Short mmCIF file of C-alpha atoms and ligand atoms in Angstrom, two decimals:
data_model
loop_
_atom_site.label_atom_id
_atom_site.label_comp_id
_atom_site.label_asym_id
_atom_site.label_seq_id
_atom_site.Cartn_x
_atom_site.Cartn_y
_atom_site.Cartn_z
CA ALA A 1 92.59 34.80 73.74
CA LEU A 2 91.23 37.50 76.09
CA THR A 3 91.99 38.53 79.68
CA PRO A 4 89.18 38.39 82.24
CA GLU A 5 89.53 42.18 82.39
CA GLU A 6 89.26 42.51 78.59
CA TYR A 7 85.98 40.55 78.66
CA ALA A 8 84.72 42.94 81.33
CA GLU A 9 85.64 45.98 79.21
CA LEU A 10 84.19 44.67 75.95
CA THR A 11 80.98 43.72 77.75
CA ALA A 12 80.60 47.11 79.43
CA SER A 13 81.40 48.82 76.13
CA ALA A 14 78.69 46.89 74.29
CA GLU A 15 76.21 47.62 77.09
CA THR A 16 77.09 51.32 76.84
CA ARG A 17 76.44 51.26 73.09
CA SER A 18 73.08 49.74 74.01
CA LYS A 19 72.25 52.64 76.37
CA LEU A 20 73.43 55.18 73.80
CA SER A 21 71.16 53.68 71.12
CA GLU A 22 68.19 53.84 73.51
CA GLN A 23 69.06 57.47 74.25
CA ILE A 24 69.05 58.20 70.51
CA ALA A 25 65.60 56.59 70.23
CA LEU A 26 64.42 58.84 73.06
CA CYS A 27 65.84 61.80 71.11
CA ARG A 28 63.91 60.89 67.96
CA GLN A 29 60.73 60.90 70.06
CA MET A 30 61.63 64.31 71.44
CA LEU A 31 61.75 65.42 67.81
CA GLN A 32 58.22 64.09 67.34
CA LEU A 33 57.08 65.87 70.51
CA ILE A 34 58.57 69.11 69.18
CA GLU A 35 56.81 68.51 65.86
CA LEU A 36 53.54 67.83 67.69
CA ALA A 37 53.97 71.10 69.62
CA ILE A 38 54.63 73.07 66.42
CA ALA A 39 51.56 71.51 64.71
CA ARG A 40 49.26 72.19 67.67
CA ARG A 41 50.50 75.78 67.67
CA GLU A 42 49.72 76.16 63.97
CA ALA A 43 46.25 74.67 64.53
CA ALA A 44 45.43 77.10 67.37
CA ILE A 45 46.45 80.06 65.20
CA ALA A 46 44.50 78.74 62.20
CA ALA A 47 41.33 78.31 64.29
CA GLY A 48 40.89 82.07 64.68
CA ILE A 49 40.46 81.97 68.46
CA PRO A 50 40.16 85.52 69.89
CA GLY A 51 43.55 86.81 70.96
CA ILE A 52 45.44 83.76 69.64
CA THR A 53 47.47 85.57 66.98
CA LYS A 54 50.69 84.70 65.10
CA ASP A 55 52.68 86.36 67.92
CA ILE A 56 51.51 83.49 70.16
CA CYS A 57 54.42 81.61 71.75
CA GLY A 58 52.82 78.16 71.64
CA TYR A 59 55.38 76.33 73.80
CA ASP A 60 53.89 73.10 75.15
CA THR A 61 54.51 72.23 78.81
CA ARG A 62 55.55 68.70 77.82
CA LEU A 63 58.56 70.20 76.02
CA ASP A 64 60.24 70.45 79.43
CA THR A 65 60.90 66.71 79.01
CA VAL A 66 63.28 67.76 76.22
CA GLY A 67 65.32 69.67 78.81
CA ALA A 68 65.94 66.63 81.01
CA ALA A 69 66.41 64.30 78.03
CA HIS A 70 69.16 66.69 76.88
CA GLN A 71 70.86 66.51 80.27
CA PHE A 72 70.84 62.70 80.22
CA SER A 73 72.51 62.89 76.80
CA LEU A 74 75.29 64.97 78.36
CA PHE A 75 75.60 62.38 81.17
CA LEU A 76 76.01 59.52 78.68
CA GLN A 77 78.72 61.51 76.89
CA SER A 78 80.87 61.46 80.14
CA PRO A 79 82.77 58.23 80.78
CA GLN A 80 81.40 58.16 84.37
CA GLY A 81 78.27 57.09 82.47
CA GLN A 82 78.88 53.64 83.97
CA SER A 83 76.34 53.94 86.80
CA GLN A 84 40.08 74.68 79.42
CA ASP A 85 40.20 74.84 75.59
CA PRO A 86 41.73 71.60 74.22
CA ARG A 87 43.21 73.53 71.30
CA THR A 88 45.48 75.51 73.67
CA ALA A 89 45.65 73.41 76.85
CA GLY A 90 49.22 73.20 78.08
CA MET A 91 50.16 75.91 75.59
CA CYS A 92 51.98 79.12 76.47
CA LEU A 93 49.97 82.08 75.18
CA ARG A 94 52.52 84.82 75.84
CA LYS A 95 52.98 87.13 72.85
CA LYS A 96 56.57 87.79 71.75
CA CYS A 97 57.65 85.32 74.41
CA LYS A 98 61.21 85.38 75.72
CA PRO A 99 61.51 82.51 78.25
CA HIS A 100 60.62 80.26 75.28
CA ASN A 101 62.02 82.56 72.57
CA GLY A 102 62.62 80.55 69.39
CA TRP A 103 61.86 77.20 71.01
CA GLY A 104 60.92 75.41 67.78
CA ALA A 105 64.23 75.84 65.98
CA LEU A 106 66.44 75.79 69.06
CA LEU A 107 65.03 72.61 70.66
CA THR A 108 65.13 70.94 67.24
CA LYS A 109 68.80 71.96 66.97
CA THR A 110 69.69 70.68 70.44
CA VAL A 111 68.07 67.27 69.97
CA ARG A 112 69.43 66.69 66.47
CA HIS A 113 72.82 67.72 67.86
CA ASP A 114 72.56 65.18 70.69
CA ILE A 115 71.82 62.42 68.20
CA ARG A 116 75.05 63.20 66.34
CA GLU A 117 77.06 63.37 69.57
CA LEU A 118 75.58 60.09 70.87
CA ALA A 119 76.28 58.39 67.53
CA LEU A 120 79.86 59.70 67.65
CA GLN A 121 80.20 58.16 71.13
CA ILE A 122 79.01 54.81 69.77
CA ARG A 123 81.69 54.95 67.07
CA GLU A 124 84.41 55.74 69.59
CA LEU A 125 83.29 52.71 71.60
CA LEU A 126 83.36 50.47 68.52
CA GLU A 127 86.84 51.75 67.77
CA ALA A 128 87.97 51.01 71.35
CA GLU A 129 86.41 47.54 71.18
CA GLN A 130 88.38 46.85 68.01
CA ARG A 131 91.50 48.13 69.80
CA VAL A 132 91.07 45.76 72.76
CA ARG A 133 90.51 42.79 70.44
CA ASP A 134 93.57 43.96 68.47
CA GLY A 135 95.63 43.96 71.68
CA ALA A 136 94.55 40.43 72.60
CA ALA A 137 95.29 39.14 69.08
CA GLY A 138 98.77 40.69 69.28
CA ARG A 139 99.37 38.91 72.58
CA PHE A 140 98.01 35.70 71.00
ZN1 ZN B 201 56.44 81.11 75.98
#
């Protein structure tokens, strides 16, 4: 009981939900990466390496992935979303660091926030899908 154009919308909506779920999966892995960075930071401090004190920043270079993953989450929230020492390698050793100030809690907060936003988007799409099917049943 559906228009050709209603099929096209429902299909694109379901495909968008698919992309949003994959983005949430990516986000959960960013949370693991952040956890891995925190744990590697705690290990370097526990090892008693000269100069590697509790003031050590500890930001891992791979955490820049979190920055671009976050931007892709913002993209998918727009409706145009149709288109050296191994213990410290990669680790930022600045003390009282400010470019990475508070990275552990802030990056955790961003990524967890993106999961909630992406899940909200999925729910809006399920609501809209139910609305289209409601419109076609009313015309039926
Ligand atoms: Zn730093």
